[PDB]
């Protein structure tokens, strides 16, 4: 799969690439042609003149005239060099700008198509794969592609042109010697190819490891409340660290192989030098060639050899890009069997729903050996209501998922109006179906936008009508900003009942002819449930509905009732018929200033491996100084080779130069490898340390930090990955080349000051000018860098919001809306990339142009000095070479400066997140750890305000008391603050008024880890992790290796053990992301077991039996009653029996305690609890 990286290159894109390639060819061949112009004559020296006093030459007047002639020749050469500099100015800008624009367009289209491909997959594909990596891909791999299809290919083609044009000039002049060097060239090609293949494979593995780490981080951050409650920060940090170690090892291998490749290239270049000199000597004694011929060949070929040796980093970048582009285009090329974006299907104009399920056999793709439905049969007529009843894991949610065709059945047929649903358009099929899931999931936006996700072209009046139909109007009206209130991830900033009612309204605005309600009133209370049922009954004739529920009134009111038993339906009829059939339904009803200093600050964290720094520095000075030193050595060797005054063997003896060239090649190989490897290893270790430290700091943060809309899970993951990537991009094998260039400039200055003088004053003139160019570029790029970061975060958020909630997006047919949102988010980075392309291309063109222009100015000034006889003609060439190398060094440093600007802000953000301290420090060892606690919980006038909505009073100073062995039942309406009490007792937030005492001690004076370890909580929405069942249960009691036997007994205590035993792989069965690959009852029971394995002193239950059977509820209640005394228990529920069985009951009216006492005490008085118990009875 090669050249797939350019799959999305259009006509304009290909034109940009072609013109950039042509400009690269011209720019590359400019140099060998310029040296051949010097080779137009034999000696490259217009006249020996005074330097040769071989003949008497006693002319004091004619020497002045021939000096004037030399000045004229130098002036003509300077004019030619100025023209070549202008041409270079044009061509370098053209090539870099065109290639960078091409890369930007391809990256934009690749991101768009990758997101489209991700949104185009099936539910089963999302179940099989760890989709948590995908976002990291969108952030990381595409970027690795961007630095491999940009300016790097332009530079590679330029150096290829230099090399091959020099070789063509060689075939023109000295074909035999040129063929001898082109015989060595294949070794360079083979080495480059092999090392590029190895580097691409290593990059693929490293990016896989980074994607694994990103998936781990995304899962941990999405469930940060569970991690904080159970104190799992260390374990998640270790899980991140394992993938960090793998990525670090792969990066070290990548650096090793890249530096081997570069050093081998340089060694081969020097070996080509040595062999060319040998063969030229051999031919120049045999009289086959003249001295001018072999010098011409040398000057034509060897500089291009150096050019390819310098080019090899672009090959490294292209190999990294190819390694990155593997999984992206593997996912892009995947074709789902159920295509939601296909336009080929039937679209019936009139559909009176006739849901038929004919001998349906189904098994989930992730767990395919287990059978769920075995010949399911159902016939639902138009406008009727069917109530699906059974036990947990029976397959009711499976039937709901099959109705909307999230999966296809292996056997059987699902049809509507006698038409099989596989022949109907998938988008049209899911558009006529409105579904409310077992535990709904919203999106991190306003309430109005969440409602509009059901149907986009919806007016505000009918939104209001649907919200009234869902009994949600009152609390939205009480909310400031109305329906523009922002809700957290998955509706985390709304209560369970409010979130469920918002989901109901979202389903209702769809105006569905097929309604699916999978426990739509699980989190509702009596009044809201009653009014919602009345509202649904008002408009029940128009549509056909399927309902799964726990309350008996809604099951009785259904037109027909179906009962699940072992994958089939065993009872199907009216309520009276099933009542008189004494079946399963019978026993169910019976049972009742962005500082620049930040760079150095981050590099100070890299001080542990300082020997790598010093070794790399030494090697960088060695090679950077060797380059101008080799410029002098080559000139001296050429001069000695020309002066063959002793005739032949003296010159065979000059083979010592091939020795010296081989020695220099060995030294260059060793030093280049050593410098690159040391810097790359230190930088990769720094990258690991930054990832680890930033993730640890993120885990240290408070719940309010994650409640901030800007600290979204996708935003957090994108921030982490991108900040680390930028700092790595400025701290890899690149700082080495800045040190090498500094050494190059220093050595050039030294050699120009030794051999000559008054010409280095020109070098001190060029160093400012070129630098100032990069300077402004740097500033400008920094001016946009921050913006880009922000935009990327936003884009990342959208992508994660689409991936973490993919089932909801598929059910809502909102994939196109999220694609449009992703494109709108990516809009700003696109224009930023185009502008940066233009600016950096201008910078490169300016650097090369001033290189050439200052070289011409050096010609002019040196000619003036020679005419004045202030400084000899022989040494001007070495000073000119030093000027050229210094200009190249400064230009390369200025080219680096953009990356320094881009990573300065990332380093600042990294330092900011590291040094941030939360208000409630979960990592602090300071605090009070009582030796033994009695478990007495007391809220004393606690007033709490949520930081995201600070004005709204949630708790207005309610008093609460519960003792050891007591059970406290918190009752109230939705939004009253029952879960707020649980979240406050976990020290998620600190109340501003009032205080919570645990055995008389304020919870702010205790160690937060110790306090959290004393409490076991079951949340309103249980959340598991994408790992094994046993690992999920053992996650309850961290800081201790939980044994298998106690996991088994905790599962037994939660009535989930039998289901685990029935599963293949038993307790090693992997659960999906957030528990999505489990039944709601099974997931809730596993959460209960996770809480119970702790054996906590303070048990907190928040609707812990929201989705359980009568059998499961009875078993769990008996298990809790076994251990009532000896632990304090607080329970939030709307079931009458659970509340009336508790020791004490507290009623919370809009945040205040209103009634407190036993069940009989509250029943005897005529209050709201009496009203509830009377309504239920
Ligand atoms: C180290 C720092 C150096 C300085 C840093 C920044 C330098 C920015 C210069 C880069 C530069 C010229 C590059 C030529 C260089 C020559 C060789 C270089 C030799 C180097 C020694 C990009 O080139 C522009 O040229 C345009 C045509 O000339 C092209 O327009 C496209 O062509 C087709 C494409 O598909 C299509 O038809 C179509 O898409 C376009 O028509 C584009 O190619 C591009 O926009 C100009 O950039 C900037 O120029 C200024 C004009 O003042 C513009 O200001 C704005 O213009 C209004 C627009 O709305 C605004 O309203 C106004 O608010 C503001 O005034 C900017 O917009 C921007 O363009
Ligand atoms: C070694 C490194 C540093 C440089 C490698 C050179 C590439 C940048 C050049 C070589 C050949 C060029 C390609 C020649 C032909 C094509 C196929 C063309 O797409 C197709 O026709 C493929 C089928 C499809 O449309 O899906 C897109 C441009 C592309 C990849 C060109 C893009 C630029 C390529 C890959
Ligand atoms: C010394 C002069 C002659 C220049 C040296 C480079 C060239 C000889 C060119 C011609 C063929 C080119 C190669 C042709 C194809 C590839 C594979 C391409 O993809 C891979 O890295 C393969 C990875 C994999 O298959 O897993 C990357 C660029 C590379 C090595 C090219 C690198 C540059 C090469 C060696
Ligand atoms: C005129 C001069 C420059 C010599 C002309 C020949 C070279 C340009 C050719 C001859 C043999 C070629 C090599 C033959 C085979 C390979 C292995 C190849 O490896 C892969 O990409 C393998 C990928 C896979 O197997 O999946 C990379 C290019 C390379 C080094 C080639 C690079 C270009 C070479 C040196
Ligand atoms: S300065 C960058 C580039 N030159 C080299 O890479 C290089 C390696 S070795 C070498 N030059 C020897 C010392 N060159 C000569 O002896 C020589 C004779 S004539 C000449 N160089 C002309 C003046 N050089 C250039 O035009 C030139 C531009 S860039 C460049 N060399
Ligand atoms: N995405 C999935 N991948 C694999 N197995 C799954 C998936 N979803 C559910 N299961 C399993 O398939 C079986 C059927 O569960 P299902 O969700 O259909 O039950 P249910 O009737 O909706 O139950 P509940 O009353 O608890 O909501 C269970 O064993 C469950 O763990
Ligand atoms: N993270 C949050 N940020 C802001 N407001 C919140 C947050 N969580 C809950 N709220 C709001 O606080 C109020 C009560 O929330 P809470 O979850 O404590 O209620 P509850 O009594 O447990 O409700 P329910 O019975 O519906 O689960 C509601 O107005 C709710 O929208
Ligand atoms: Mg279910
Ligand atoms: Mg709640």
Residue 326 Cα to chain centre, angstroms: 16
User: From atom 7 of ligand 6, which residue's Cα is the shortest distance away?
Assistant: 1077
What would the two tokens of residue 505 be?
Answer: 């309204």
Q: Decide: helix, strand or coil at residue 1131.
A: strand
Compute CA distances 610 → 292, 604, 605, 621, 1105, whole Å: 50, 10, 11, 17, 58
Pair 437, 1074: CB distance under 8 Å:
no
Q: Give the end-to-end CA distance of the chain in Å, rounded to a whole number.
A: 70
Residues 6+ positions from 273 with CB-CB distance below 8 Å: 302, 305, 661, 665
Q: Quick one: residue 267, left, alpha or beta (phi over 0 = left, psi -120 to 50 = alpha)? A: alpha
Report the C-alpha gap between 95 and 27 in whole angstroms: 9
Please indicate whether residue 8, judged by its CB atom, sits closer than 6 Å to ligand 2: no
User: From atom 6 of ligand 3, which residue's Cα is the shortest distance away?
Assistant: 189
Q: How far is the CA of 1033 from the centre of ligand 9 (A)?
A: 23
Report the C-alpha gap between 475 and 467 in whole angstroms: 10
Residue 921 has a CB neighbour count (10 Å cut-off) of: 16
The CA-based dihedral angle spanning residues 118, 121, 123, 128, taken in that order and rounded to the nearest 10 degrees:
-80
Report the C-alpha gap between 1146 and 1169 in whole angstroms: 9
Residue 779 Cα to chain centre, angstroms: 27
What would the two tokens of residue 435 be?
Answer: 């579904």
Q: Which long-range contacts (CB under 8 A, 24 or more apart) does 583-591 make?
A: 584/389, 584/390, 585/389, 585/561, 588/389, 588/1110, 589/552, 591/1110, 591/1111, 591/1114
Report the C-alpha gap between 247 and 243 in whole angstroms: 6
For residue 1041, what is the DSSP state? -
Q: How far is the CA of 567 from the centre of ligand 8 (A)?
A: 14
Q: Nearest CA to 450 among 497, 521, 500, 517?
A: 500
Phi, psi of 608 (to 5 degrees): -65, -45
Please indicate whether residue 197, judged by its CB atom, sits closer than 6 Å to ligand 7: no
Beta strands in 1133-1177 (DSSP E): 1144-1149, 1152-1157
Q: Residue written as tokens 């009014």?
A: 531
Pocket perturbation via mutation, ligand 6, pick of 129, 391, 398, 521 by most ligand atoms within 8 A of CB? 398
Please indicate whether residue 187, judged by its CB atom, sits closer than 6 Å to ligand 4: no
Report which bound ligand comes closest to the CA of 1070: 6
Report the C-alpha gap between 634 and 276 in whole angstroms: 13
Report which bound ligand comes closest to the CA of 326: 3
Residues 6+ positions from 23 with CB-CB distance below 8 Å: 91, 92, 94, 95, 98, 154
User: From atom 28 of ligand 4, which residue's Cα is the shortest distance away?
Assistant: 193
- Helices 876-915, 713-729: axis angle to 10 degrees equals 150
Pair 943, 993: CB distance under 8 Å:
yes
- For domain 937-1176, the CATH architecture is 3-Layer(aba) Sandwich (3.40)
Report the C-alpha gap between 795 and 802 in whole angstroms: 11
Residue 1005 has a CB neighbour count (10 Å cut-off) of: 12
Q: How far is the CA of 522 from the centre of ligand 7 (A)?
A: 16
What would the two tokens of residue 266 be?
Answer: 């340089």
The CA-based dihedral angle spanning residues 131, 133, 138, 142, taken in that order and rounded to the nearest 10 degrees:
-130
Please indicate whether residue 945, judged by its CB atom, sits closer than 6 Å to ligand 7: no
Phi, psi of 996 (to 5 degrees): -110, 125
Report the C-alpha gap between 743 and 626 in whole angstroms: 9
Q: How far is the CA of 976 from the centre of ligand 9 (A)?
A: 8
Q: Nearest CA to 712 among 808, 787, 799?
A: 799
Report the C-alpha gap between 566 and 394 in whole angstroms: 7
Q: Residue written as tokens 């939705």?
A: 974
- Helices 233-285, 610-642: axis angle to 10 degrees equals 10
Q: Nearest CA to 436 among 505, 491, 538?
A: 505
Please indicate whether residue 842, judged by its CB atom, sits closer than 6 Å to ligand 1: yes
Phi, psi of 174 (to 5 degrees): -120, 50
Pair 202, 144: CB distance under 8 Å:
no
Q: Nearest CA to 311 among 358, 374, 243, 265?
A: 265
Q: Residue written as tokens 């109530």?
A: 387
What would the two tokens of residue 238 be?
Answer: 């270790």
Pocket perturbation via mutation, ligand 7, pick of 489, 974, 980 by most ligand atoms within 8 A of CB? 980
Number of H-type helices and E-type strands within the chain: 40, 20
Report the C-alpha gap between 267 and 305 in whole angstroms: 11
The CA-based dihedral angle spanning residues 855, 856, 858, 861, taken in that order and rounded to the nearest 10 degrees:
-170
Ligand 2 atom index nearest CA of 315: 3
Please indicate whether residue 395, judged by its CB atom, sits closer than 6 Å to ligand 6: yes
Q: What are the DSSP calls for 270-332, one per residue?
A: HHHHHHHHHHHHHHHHTTSS-HHHHHHHHHHHHHHHHHHHHHHHHHHHHHHHHHHHHHHHHHH
Please indicate whether residue 564, judged by its CB atom, sits closer than 6 Å to ligand 1: no
Q: Nearest CA to 512 among 469, 460, 482?
A: 469
Ligand 5 atom index nearest CA of 885: 1
Residue 380 Cα to chain centre, angstroms: 46
Ligand 2 atom index nearest CA of 196: 1
User: From atom 32 of ligand 2, which residue's Cα is the shortest distance away?
Assistant: 6
The CA-based dihedral angle spanning residues 806, 808, 812, 813, taken in that order and rounded to the nearest 10 degrees:
10
Pocket perturbation via mutation, ligand 4, pick of 180, 186, 201, 318 by most ligand atoms within 8 A of CB? 186
The 3 state secondary structure assigned to 991-1039 is CCEEEEEECCEEHHHCCHHHHHHCEEEECCCCCCCCCEHHHHHHCCCCC
Sheet of 955-962, strands arranged across: 955-962, 937-944, 993-998, 1001-1002
Pocket perturbation via mutation, ligand 1, pick of 842, 894, 901 by most ligand atoms within 8 A of CB? 842
Report the C-alpha gap between 175 and 279 in whole angstroms: 12
Pairing mode of beta strands 411-416, 419-420: antiparallel
Pairing mode of beta strands 385-389, 560-565: parallel
User: From atom 7 of ligand 7, which residue's Cα is the shortest distance away?
Assistant: 493
Q: Decide: helix, strand or coil at residue 592.
A: coil
Q: Residue written as tokens 């009289």?
A: 287
Q: What are the DSSP calls for 331-351, one per residue?
A: HHT---SS-TT---SB--S--
Q: How far is the CA of 110 from the centre of ligand 7 (A)?
A: 41
Q: Quick one: residue 310, left, alpha or beta (phi over 0 = left, psi -120 to 50 = alpha)? A: alpha
Sheet of 1144-1149, strands arranged across: 1015-1018, 1098-1102, 1128-1132, 967-972, 1144-1149, 1152-1157
Phi, psi of 509 (to 5 degrees): -65, -15
Ligand 7 atom index nearest CA of 478: 29
What would the two tokens of residue 351 be?
Answer: 């559909």
**How big is the CA angle at 855 (ends 852 and 861), to the nearest 5 degrees?**
145
Pair 843, 895: CB distance under 8 Å:
yes
Q: Decide: helix, strand or coil at residue 546.
A: strand
| Class (C level, CATH) for 4-50+58-337+598-915 | mainly alpha
**Alpha helix (H) ranges present in 570-700?**
575-580, 584-590, 598-604, 610-642, 649-652, 656-700
Pair 870, 749: CB distance under 8 Å:
no
Residue 957 Cα to chain centre, angstroms: 43
Q: Nearest CA to 781 among 248, 100, 256?
A: 100
Q: Nearest CA to 836 among 294, 96, 41, 256?
A: 96
Please indicate whether residue 946, judged by its CB atom, sits closer than 6 Å to ligand 2: no
The 3 state secondary structure assigned to 430-491 is HHCEEEECCCCCCCCCEHHHHHHCCCCCCCHHHHHHHHHHCCCHHHHHHCCCHHHCECCHHH
Q: Nearest CA to 634 among 874, 329, 299?
A: 299
User: From atom 26 of ligand 2, which residue's Cα is the shortest distance away?
Assistant: 7
Q: Decide: helix, strand or coil at residue 1155.
A: strand
User: For residue 968, what are the β-bridge partners?
Assistant: 1130, 1144
Report the C-alpha gap between 1073 and 377 in whole angstroms: 30
Residue 333 has a CB neighbour count (10 Å cut-off) of: 11
User: From atom 15 of ligand 1, which residue's Cα is the shortest distance away?
Assistant: 842
What would the two tokens of residue 971 be?
Answer: 């009752």
The DSSP element (H or E) to which 570 belongs, if any, is: strand 568-573
Phi, psi of 659 (to 5 degrees): -60, -60
Report the C-alpha gap between 991 and 908 in whole angstroms: 32
Pair 1100, 1036: CB distance under 8 Å:
no
Beta strands in 1032-1117 (DSSP E): 1098-1102
The CA-based dihedral angle spanning residues 471, 476, 482, 486, taken in that order and rounded to the nearest 10 degrees:
-120
Pairing mode of beta strands 1098-1102, 385-389: unpaired
Residue 646 has a CB neighbour count (10 Å cut-off) of: 9
Please indicate whether residue 845, judged by its CB atom, sits closer than 6 Å to ligand 1: yes
Residues 6+ positions from 77 with CB-CB distance below 8 Å: 856, 859
User: For residue 940, what are the β-bridge partners?
Assistant: 995
Pocket perturbation via mutation, ligand 3, pick of 178, 189, 191 by most ligand atoms within 8 A of CB? 189
Q: How far is the CA of 6 from the centre of ligand 2 (A)?
A: 5
What would the two tokens of residue 186 be?
Answer: 């294949």
Q: Nearest CA to 1050 among 1032, 1025, 1024, 1069?
A: 1032
Residues whose Cβ atom is located within 5 A of ion ligand 8: 397, 438, 1080
Report the C-alpha gap between 227 and 217 in whole angstroms: 12
Q: How far is the CA of 658 from the centre of ligand 1 (A)?
A: 52
**Alpha helix (H) ranges present in 730-814?**
735-755, 760-804, 806-812
What would the two tokens of residue 168 be?
Answer: 């063509």
**Alpha helix (H) ranges present in 51-128?**
62-120, 123-128
User: For residue 1157, what are the β-bridge partners?
Assistant: 1145
Q: How far is the CA of 5 from the centre of ligand 4 (A)?
A: 20
What's the farthest any 2 CA atoms get from each other in the chain?
137
Two domains, one topology: 4-50+58-337+598-915 and 937-1176: no
User: From atom 12 of ligand 5, which residue's Cα is the shortest distance away?
Assistant: 631
For residue 1123, what is the DSSP state? T
Pocket perturbation via mutation, ligand 6, pick of 438, 563, 1078 by most ligand atoms within 8 A of CB? 1078
Task: Give the residue extent of every domain in the chain.
Answer: 4-50+58-337+598-915, 937-1176
Pair 599, 637: CB distance under 8 Å:
no
What would the two tokens of residue 286 be?
Answer: 């045999």
What would the two tokens of residue 144 be?
Answer: 């690795």
Residue 1093 Cα to chain centre, angstroms: 35
Q: How far is the CA of 870 from the centre of ligand 6 (A)?
A: 93
Report which bound ligand comes closest to the CA of 1059: 6
Q: Decide: helix, strand or coil at residue 371.
A: coil
Report the C-alpha gap between 1009 and 1011 in whole angstroms: 5
User: From atom 19 of ligand 2, which residue's Cα is the shortest distance away?
Assistant: 7
For residue 494, what is the DSSP state? S
Q: Residue written as tokens 């449930």?
A: 529
Residue 244 Cα to chain centre, angstroms: 14
Compute CA distances 675 → 562, 585, 732, 733, 855, whole Å: 74, 77, 11, 8, 30
Scored b (16 or more CB within 10 A) or e, 570-579 reads ebbbebeebb
What would the two tokens of residue 346 be?
Answer: 């039937």
Please indicate whether residue 102, judged by its CB atom, sits closer than 6 Å to ligand 2: no
Ligand 3 atom index nearest CA of 190: 35
- Helices 713-729, 132-146: axis angle to 10 degrees equals 30
Phi, psi of 792 (to 5 degrees): -55, -45
Residues 6+ positions from 956 with CB-CB distance below 8 Å: 943, 1150, 1151, 1152
Q: Residue written as tokens 């300082």?
A: 610
Q: How far is the CA of 397 from the centre of ligand 8 (A)?
A: 4
User: From atom 7 of ligand 1, which residue's Cα is the shortest distance away?
Assistant: 839
Please report how many Cα atoms fall inside a 13 Å half-sphere around the Cα of residue 302, on the Cβ side. Answer: 22
Report the C-alpha gap between 85 and 1159 in whole angstroms: 94
Report the C-alpha gap between 676 and 654 in whole angstroms: 33
Q: Nearest CA to 1006 among 994, 1015, 997?
A: 997
User: For residue 1002, what are the β-bridge partners?
Assistant: 997
Pair 1022, 1087: CB distance under 8 Å:
yes
Phi, psi of 1152 (to 5 degrees): -125, 140
Q: Residue written as tokens 């699980």?
A: 522
Report the C-alpha gap between 53 and 274 in whole angstroms: 32
The CA-based dihedral angle spanning residues 600, 602, 607, 610, taken in that order and rounded to the nearest 10 degrees:
-70
Residue 616 has a CB neighbour count (10 Å cut-off) of: 25
Is 1163 buried (19+), middle (13-18) or exposed (0-12) by CB count in 10 A? middle
What would the two tokens of residue 884 be?
Answer: 């050229």
């Amino acid at each position: 799969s090669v050249l797939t990286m350019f799959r999305y290159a259009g006509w304009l894109d290909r034109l940009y690439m072609l013109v950039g390639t042509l400009a690269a060819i011209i720019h590359g061949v400019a140099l060998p042609l310029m040296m051949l112009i010097f080779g137009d004559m034999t000696d490259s020296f217009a006249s020996v003149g005074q330097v040769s006093k071989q003949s008497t030459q006693m002319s004091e007047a004619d020497k002045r005239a021939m000096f004037a002639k030399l000045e004229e020749e130098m002036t003509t050469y300077a004019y030619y060099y100025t023209g070549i500099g202008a041409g270079v100015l044009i061509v370098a800008y053209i090539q870099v700008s065109f290639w960078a624009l091409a890369a930007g367009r391809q990256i934009h289209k690749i991101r768009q198509k990758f997101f489209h491909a991700i949104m185009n997959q099936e539910i089963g594909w999302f179940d099989v794969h760890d989709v948590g990596e995908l976002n990291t891909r969108l952030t990381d791999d595409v970027s690795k592609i961007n630095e491999g299809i940009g300016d790097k290919i332009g530079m590679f083609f330029q150096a290829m042109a230099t090399f091959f044009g020099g070789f063509i000039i060689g075939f023109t002049r000295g074909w035999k010697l040129t063929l001898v060097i082109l015989a060595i060239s294949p070794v360079l090609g083979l080495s480059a190819g092999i090392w590029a293949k190895i580097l691409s494979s290593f990059t693929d593995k490293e990016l896989h490891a980074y994607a694994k780490a990103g998936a781990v981080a995304e899962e941990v951050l999405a469930a940060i409340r569970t991690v904080i409650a159970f104190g799992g920060q260390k374990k998640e940090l270790e899980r991140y660290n394992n993938n960090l170690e793998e990525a670090k090892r792969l990066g070290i291998k990548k650096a090793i192989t890249a530096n081997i490749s570069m050093g081998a290239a340089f060694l081969l270049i020097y070996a080509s030098y040595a062999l060319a000199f040998w063969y030229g000597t051999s031919l120049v004694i045999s009289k086959e060639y003249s001295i001018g011929q072999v010098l011409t060949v040398f000057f034509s070929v060897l500089i291009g050899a150096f050019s390819v040796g310098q080019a090899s980093p672009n090959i490294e970048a292209f190999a990294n890009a190819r390694g990155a582009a593997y999984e992206v285009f593997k996912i892009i090329d995947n074709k789902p069997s159920i295509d939601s974006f296909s336009k080929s299907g039937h679209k019936p104009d009139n559909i009176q729903g006739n849901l038929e399920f004919k001998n349906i056999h189904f098994s989930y793709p992730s767990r395919k050996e287990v059978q769920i439905l075995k010949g399911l049969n159902l016939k639902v007529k138009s406008g009727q209501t069917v109530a699906l009843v059974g036990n947990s894991g029976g397959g009711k949610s499976t039937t709901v998922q099959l109705m909307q065709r999230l999966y296809d059945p292996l056997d059987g047929m699902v049809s509507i109006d006698g038409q099989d649903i596989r022949t109907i358009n998938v988008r049209y099929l899911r558009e006529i179906i409105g579904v409310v899931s077992q535990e709904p999931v919203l999106f991190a936006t306003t309430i109005a936008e969440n409602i509009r996700y059901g149907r986009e072209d919806v007016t505000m009046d009918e939104i209001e009508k649907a919200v009234k139909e869902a009994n949600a109007y009152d609390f939205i009206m009480k909310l400031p900003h109305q329906f523009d209130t922002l809700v957290g991830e998955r509706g985390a900033q709304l209560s369970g009942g409010q979130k469920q009612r918002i989901a109901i309204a979202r389903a209702l605005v769809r105006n569905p002819k097929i309604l699916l309600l999978d426990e739509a009133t699980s989190a509702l209370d009596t009044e809201s449930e009653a009014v919602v049922q009345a509202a649904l009954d008002k408009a029940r004739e128009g549509r056909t509905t399927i309902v799964i529920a726990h309350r008996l009134s809604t099951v009785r009111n259904a037109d027909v009732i179906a009962g699940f038993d072992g994958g089939v339906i065993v009872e199907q009829g009216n309520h009276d018929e099933l009542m008189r059939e004494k079946g399963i339904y019978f026993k169910l009803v019976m049972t009742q200033d962005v500082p620049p200093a930040s760079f150095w600050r981050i590099l100070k964290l890299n001080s542990t491996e300082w020997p790598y720094f010093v070794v790399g520095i030494f090697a960088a000075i060695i090679n950077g100084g060797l380059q101008p030193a080799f410029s002098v050595i080559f000139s001296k060797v050429v001069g000695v080779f020309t002066n063959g005054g002793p005739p032949e063997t003296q010159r065979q003896n000059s083979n010592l130069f091939s020795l010296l060239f081989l020695i220099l090649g060995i030294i260059s190989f060793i030093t280049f490898f050593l410098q690159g490897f040391t810097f790359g290893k230190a930088g990769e270790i720094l990258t690991k340390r930054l990832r680890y430290m930033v993730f640890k700091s993120m885990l240290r943060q408070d719940v309010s930090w994650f409640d901030d809309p800007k600290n979204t899970t996708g935003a957090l993951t994108t921030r982490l990955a991108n900040d680390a990537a930028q700092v790595k991009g400025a701290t890899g094998s690149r700082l080495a080349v800045i040190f090498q260039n500094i050494a190059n400039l220093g050595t050039g200055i030294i050699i120009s000051l030794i051999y000559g003088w008054q010409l280095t004053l020109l070098l001190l003139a060029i160093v400012p000018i070129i630098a100032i160019a990069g300077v402004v570029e740097m500033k400008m790029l920094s001016g946009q860098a921050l913006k880009d970061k922000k935009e990327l975060e936003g884009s990342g958020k959208i992508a994660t919001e689409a991936i973490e909630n993919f089932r909801t997006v598929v059910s809502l047919t909102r994939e196109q809306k999220f694609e449009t949102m992703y494109a709108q988010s990516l809009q700003i980075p696109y224009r930023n990339a185009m502008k940066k392309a233009h600016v950096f291309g201008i910078t490169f063109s300016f650097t090369q142009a001033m290189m050439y222009f200052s070289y011409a100015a050096a010609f002019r000034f040196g000619a003036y000095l020679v005419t004045q006889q202030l400084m000899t003609f022989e040494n001007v060439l070495l000073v000119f070479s030093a000027i050229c190398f210094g200009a190249m060094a400064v230009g390369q440093v200025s080219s680096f400066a953009p990356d320094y600007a881009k990573a300065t802000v990332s380093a600042s953000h990294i330092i900011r997140i590291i040094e941030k301290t939360p208000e409630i420090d979960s990592y602090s060892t300071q605090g009070l750890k009582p030796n033994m606690l009695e478990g007495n919980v007391q809220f004393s006038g606690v007033v709490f305000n949520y930081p995201t909505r600070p004005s709204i009073p949630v708790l207005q100073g309610l008093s609460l008391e519960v003792k050891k062995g007591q059970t406290l039942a918190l009752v109230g309406s939705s939004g009253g603050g029952k879960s707020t009490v649980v979240q406050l007792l976990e020290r998620f937030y600190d109340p501003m008024a009032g205080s919570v005492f645990l055995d008389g001690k304020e919870i702010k004076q205790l160690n937060v880890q110790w306090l959290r370890a004393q409490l076991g909580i079951v949340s309103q929405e249980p959340i598991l992790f994408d790992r094994s069942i046993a690992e999920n249960i053992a996650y309850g009691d961290n800081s201790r290796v939980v044994s298998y036997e106690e996991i088994v007994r905790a599962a037994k205590e939660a009535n989930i053990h039998q289901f685990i035993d029935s599963l293949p792989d038993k307790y090693n069965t992997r659960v999906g992301d957030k528990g999505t690959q489990l039944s709601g009852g099974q997931k809730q029971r596993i959460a209960i077991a996770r809480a119970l394995v702790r054996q906590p002193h303070i048990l907190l239950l928040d609707e812990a039996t929201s989705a359980l059977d009568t059998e499961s509820e009875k078993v769990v209640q008996e298990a809790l009653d076994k251990a009532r005394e000896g632990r304090t228990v607080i329970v939030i529920a709307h079931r009458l029996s659970t509340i009336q069985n508790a020791d004490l009951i507290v009623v919370i009216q809009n945040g205040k305690v209103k009634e407190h006492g036993t069940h009989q005490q509250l029943l005897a008085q005529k209050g709201i609890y009496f009203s509830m118990v009377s309504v239920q009875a």
